[PDB]
Design a protein around this ligand. Structure first.
Ligand SMILES: CCn1c(=O)c(-c2ccc(-c3cncs3)cc2Cl)cc2cnc(Nc3ccc(N4CCN(C)CC4)cc3)nc21
Ligand SMILES: [Cl-]
Ligand SMILES: [Cl-]
Length: 297
């Protein structure tokens, strides 16, 4: 809850976290980012040598701490092969640390922006994301922020979802959400046109991420977000630049992800059965694109 006190926030985090100081467990500190959500490092588990990613947050400068608690709890209880592994958390005064596996392959955004994926490689990424989405949805978790930025890549071509800061946890009692939380360009039209959306908003975004993999950008990226949202609600299913360049089974897959009618849009479970995913190259096929993008970036 947003009204929960500073001190009740701290007591709850104290109960979640491992005891003591995280330097008691890590060493390779390179800062790899900073900003509103906190500061990110790569580091090394001192004990095991595992490379990790660590976010450090000052709770004093954290506006919405309920969402940080939620994010860790969701990660902890929703472990999956296709979700970046949550390892540990520490609280030292007002300083919160969250430790994750590190994926040395970077973001899918780098890949879509610096290389040109083939349909075999696209099918493999979509499959792996749909594996995480089937698992989430069946556990009543909606990611709500699916986009290339939130897919991370191993050097072996592992595909892992990240950034559950905006996820919703639903129940049969309240199966639908209304909050507009996701990144504009990837938002399903029903997020703006109604006040009741479910898990299939993640399928829509997945479909937008497939357009990224084909074209390099989601539709309307050059638009102000405010215009993009009106455009999604009024254009509906986005149009491809060059649909003739795509295989018939890939075009069918995209149409199933980007169906205007939520009922008719595929669920993650249904789409795991799609024949487009059958042309998937081994995930190792992604390694030259990942290495080429790492190089460019
Ligand atoms: C995107 C950076 N990144 C992460 O942020 C997190 C992360 C995710 C969630 C959480 C949670 C916080 N509270 C509850 S859960 C905490 C962390 Cl640390 C994990 C992570 C894992 N691997 C990576 N890898 C990675 C490697 C390189 C790059 N690059 C590509 C090359 N560019 C030049 C710079 C950045 C991006 C991501 N980054 C991560
Ligand atoms: Cl911070
Ligand atoms: Cl890796």
């Amino acid at each position: 809850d947003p009204f929960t006190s500073d001190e009740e926030i701290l007591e709850k985090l104290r109960s979640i976290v491992s005891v003591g100081d995280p330097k008691k467990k890590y060493t390779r500190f390179e800062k790899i980012g900073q900003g509103a959500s906190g500061t990110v490092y790569t580091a090394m588990d001192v004990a095991t040598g595992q490379e990790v990613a660590i976010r450090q947050m000052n709770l004093q400068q954290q506006p919405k701490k309920e969402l940080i608690i939620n994010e860790i709890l969701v990660m902890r209880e929703n472990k999956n092969p296709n979700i970046v592994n949550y390892l540990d958390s520490y609280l030292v005064g007002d300083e919160l640390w969250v430790v994750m596996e590190y994926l040395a392959g970077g973001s899918l955004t780098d890949v879509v922006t610096e290389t040109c994926m083939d349909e075999g490689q696209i099918a493999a990424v979509c499959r792996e994301c749909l594996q995480a989405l089937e698992f989430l949805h069946s556990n009543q978790v909606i990611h709500r922020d699916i986009k290339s930025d939130n897919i991370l890549l191993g050097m072996d071509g592992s595909v892992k979802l990240t950034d559950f800061g905006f996820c919703a946890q639903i129940t049969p009692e309240q199966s639908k959400r209304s909050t507009m939380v996701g990144t504009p360009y990837w938002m399903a039209p029903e997020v703006v046109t109604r006040k009741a959306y479910g898990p299939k908003v993640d399928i829509w975004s997945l479909g937008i991420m497939a357009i990224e993999m084909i074209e390099g950008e989601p539709p309307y990226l050059n638009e102000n977000p405010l215009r993009a949202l009106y455009l999604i609600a009024t254009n509906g299913t986005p149009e491809l630049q060059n649909p003739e360049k795509l295989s018939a089974i890939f075009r069918d897959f995209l149409n199933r992800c980007l169906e205007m009618d939520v009922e008719k849009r595929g669920s993650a479970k249904e789409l795991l059965q799609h024949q487009f995913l059958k042309i998937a190259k081994p995930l190792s096929s992604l390694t030259p694109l990942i290495a080429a993008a790492k190089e460019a970036t």
